[PDB]
Design a protein around this nucleic acid. Structure first.
Ligand SMILES: [Ca+2]
Length: 579
DNA sequence: GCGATCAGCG
DNA sequence: ACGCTGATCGCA
């Protein structure tokens, strides 16, 4: 019901200098995954290609790698990375319908061409799920069904570029797509394909020593509990703590007794068992997620892990990392932080270089709210978290422990993002009127932040959305809901999203500037990971001293704010040592 | 499949 | 009753 050529060979009219291209990878994880078909729509017509012929044709391969041949795509990072696993470079992507839909409305959840197309009343294409099936029924259909689905996606992309571009322009989002999100997409592709090298012997050795500490703590719990149980069974664990040992019930869940770490810490005066249960969970988390979980996804021949950075998922414009998540590798507890010793450079006498922004979101907040005292504090490079710990625990800067600082950190962001006196008292273990008086005092010193929090909520009520400094957008229909709880959650989104989102815009700008600068200095250094406000690279040890001057400066100059941006940096033999 | 939980980011 | 995530696991 749509006309196209089922092509055998590649012809010159398939290689026009502007086209919609579909390079279909059905597997969710596209690393080293099969390419099942190719479709091209251009001025000359519509074409389906079998990949075993087009990807071995030198004229088609050259066309893919020629940046003057412009391609409109959906999810071009997926195609680019699977092509790299075929030894093929894709260049010239001038429109990515996934990123365009994500900028226009991140809450759509647009996961395929049909879902983006529906945004513009275009419906002559089917959902990917209806063509391939789901779960155990997933299959590549017969070639004519596949060829028509891929051509319909390409024709949809061909039609939808212009209406998407013109709405992006009306939102002031068109330079965000073309100068930020599309260039970042190619940089993520390289990072994911390069991967990160893992010391599997060291990981395996820690997993052995963990399995032995786990058993010990486990017997000390059973003995403290009188009997044995499934320490992972909330039914059983709840029965032990709040019936057998008769500990107080401080919190319930929708299913029963709460056993979260916040509760278990408040019960430590009552019984020694709760601190052993905490230690047990922590050692079990390291074992399942970060030992077994990481060994499960290492590619054995190279000892590399290849994450996928989802660029069109978070409601704020942050990235996320999946399979493995390399953005939540432990760091705070000493036992967990040693996991970072297994992350090593991919070549001998290379090193890991990490740089990160200091207090990025409070600096963004200072700039956006134009708070006099908050701006002045950062013009003095004050460490607000340490300063806040001193104020809370009535100590000196000498006696600010890392746990007090991390505590003050949660208070600093909590207050500006709408923490209540109740919530503050539960976090500090102070009375509820002391928490409220503290909150009033903090807004006495930063009235401009208070004003911004009110202004941004009223602006979200009247506009229907909030924006970031580079014009990312988030719609907030619930901001006018009549239900008090639903409306309150939306108000705190209006306070938080412009700040977190602007901080995501800034570090994405830095990654793009950094790559251009690495290239102009002809350095071998390349990005491996982004962790929200941190960039991790690897480079020959001979480039470290240049990177100590280049990277901080690039990051600090990514944008110009009314306060300076501050960047800390370390390097060494493993990720562990690069802090 | 989902909720509770916990690892990270602010 | 601060916000944004992803992984594991039990299942109330
Ligand atoms: Ca930081």
């Amino acid at each position: 019901k749509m006309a196209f050529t089922l092509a055998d060979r590649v012809t010159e009219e398939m290689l026009a200098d502007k086209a919609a291209l579909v390079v279909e990878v059905v597997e969710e994880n596209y690393h080293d995954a099969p390419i099942v078909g190719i479709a091209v729509v251009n001025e000359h017509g519509r074409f389906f290609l079998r990949p075993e012929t087009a990807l071995a044709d030198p004229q088609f391969v050259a066309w893919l790698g020629d940046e003057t041949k412009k391609k409109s795509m959906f999810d071009s990072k997926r195609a680019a990375v699977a092509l790299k696993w075929k030894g093929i470079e894709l260049c010239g992507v001038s429109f990515d319908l996934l990123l365009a839909a994500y900028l226009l409305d991140p809450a759509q959840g647009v996961d395929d061409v049909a879902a983006a197309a529906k945004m513009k009343q275009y419906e002559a294409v089917r959902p990917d799920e209806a063509v391939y099936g789901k779960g155990a029924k997933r299959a590549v259909p017969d070639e004519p069904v596949l060829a028509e689905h891929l051509v319909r996606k390409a024709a949809a992309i061909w039609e939808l570029e212009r209406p998407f571009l013109d709405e992006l322009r009306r939102n002031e989002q068109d330079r965000l797509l073309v100068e930020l999100e599309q260039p970042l997409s190619s940089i993520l592709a390289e990072m994911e394909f390069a991967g990160v090298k893992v010391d599997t012997k060291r990981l395996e050795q820690m997993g052995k020593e963990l399995a032995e500490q786990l058993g010990t703590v486990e017997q000390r719990i059973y003995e403290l509990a009188g009997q044995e149980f499934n320490i992972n069974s909330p039914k059983q664990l709840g029965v032990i703590l709040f019936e057998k040992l008769q500990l107080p019930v401080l919190k319930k869940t929708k299913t029963g007794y709460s056993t979260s770490a916040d509760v278990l810490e408040k019960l430590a005066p009552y019984h020694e068992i709760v601190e052993n249960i905490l230690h047990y969970r922590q050692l079990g988390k390291l074992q399942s997620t970060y030992i077994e979980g990481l060994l499960k996804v290492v590619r054995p021949a190279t000892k590399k892990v290849h994450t996928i950075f989802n660029q069109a998922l978070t409601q704020t414009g942050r990235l996320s990392s999946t399979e493995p998540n390399l953005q939540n590798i432990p760091i705070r507890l000493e036992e967990g932080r040693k996991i970072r010793q297994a992350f090593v450079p991919s070549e001998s006498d290379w090193l890991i270089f990490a740089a990160d922004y200091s207090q990025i979101e409070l600096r963004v907040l200072a700039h956006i709210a134009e708070d006099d005292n908050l701006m002045e504090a950062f013009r003095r490079d004050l460490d607000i978290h340490t300063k806040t710990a001193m104020d809370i625990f009535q100590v000196s800067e000498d006696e600010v422990t890392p746990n007090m600082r991390r505590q003050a950190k949660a208070v600093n962001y909590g207050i500006v993002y709408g923490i209540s006196d109740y919530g503050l008292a539960q976090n500090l273990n102070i009375s509820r009127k002391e928490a409220a008086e503290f909150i009033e005092r903090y807004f006495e010193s930063f009235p401009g932040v208070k004003r911004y929090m009110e202004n941004i909520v009223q602006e979200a009520k009247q506009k229907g959305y909030v924006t970031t400094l580079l014009h990312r957008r988030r719609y907030l229909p619930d901001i006018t809901s009549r239900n008090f709880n639903v409306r309150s959650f939306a108000e705190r989104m209006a306070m938080n999203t412009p700040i977190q989102g602007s901080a995501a815009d800034i570090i994405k700008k830095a990654m793009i500037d950094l790559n251009a600068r690495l290239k102009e200095e002809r350095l071998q250094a390349h990005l491996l990971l982004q962790v929200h406000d941190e960039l991790i690279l690897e480079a020959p040890k001979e480039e470290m001293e240049r990177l100590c001057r280049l990277v901080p400066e690039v990051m600090e100059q990514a944008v110009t704010l009314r306060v300076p941006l501050k960047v800390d940096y370390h390097y060494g033999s493993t990720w562990y040592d690069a802090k």
